Ligand binder design. Structure first.
Ligand code: NA
Lengths: 54, 58
C-alpha cells in the first residue's frame, strides 16, 4: 500500500491550508454571532413596536 | 520512480483545488459578514430610535 504517500502529502506545506482553515472557522463564528444579534435585535423591534400601538 | 512523479502532481493539484475552495469560501463569508454587520448596525439604530420614542411619551 501507499498510505504513507497520501499522509506525507497532507503533512508537508500545511501552514497555508491550516491558516486558511483557521480564518474560515473564525468567519463562521463571527457569522454566527452576527446572526444571533440580528435575532435578538429583531425581537426588540417587535417588542418595542408592540408597546407603541397601545 | 515515475509512480512518485504522477503521485506528487496528483497531490499538488489536490491542494490547489482545496485552496481555491477555501479562498472562495473566505471571500464569500466576508461579504456575508459585511452585509450582516451592516444589517446589525441598522437594527441597533432602529431599536434606539424606537426606545427614544417610548421614553418621550411617559
Ligand atoms: Na447575508
Amino acid at each position: 500500500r501507499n498510505k504513507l504517500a497520501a499522509a506525507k502529502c497532507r503533512n508537508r506545506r500545511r501552514e497555508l491550508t491550516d491558516r486558511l482553515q483557521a480564518e474560515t472557522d473564525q468567519l463562521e463564528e463571527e457569522k454566527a454571532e452576527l446572526e444571533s444579534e440580528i435575532a435578538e435585535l429583531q425581537k426588540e423591534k417587535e417588542r418595542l413596536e408592540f408597546v407603541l400601538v397601545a | 520512480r515515475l509512480r512518485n512523479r504522477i503521485a506528487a502532481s496528483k497531490c499538488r493539484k489536490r491542494k490547489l483545488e482545496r485552496i481555491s475552495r477555501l479562498e472562495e469560501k473566505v471571500k464569500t463569508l466576508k461579504s456575508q459578514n459585511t452585509e450582516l454587520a451592516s444589517t446589525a448596525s441598522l437594527l441597533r439604530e432602529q431599536v434606539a430610535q424606537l426606545k427614544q420614542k417610548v421614553l418621550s411619551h411617559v
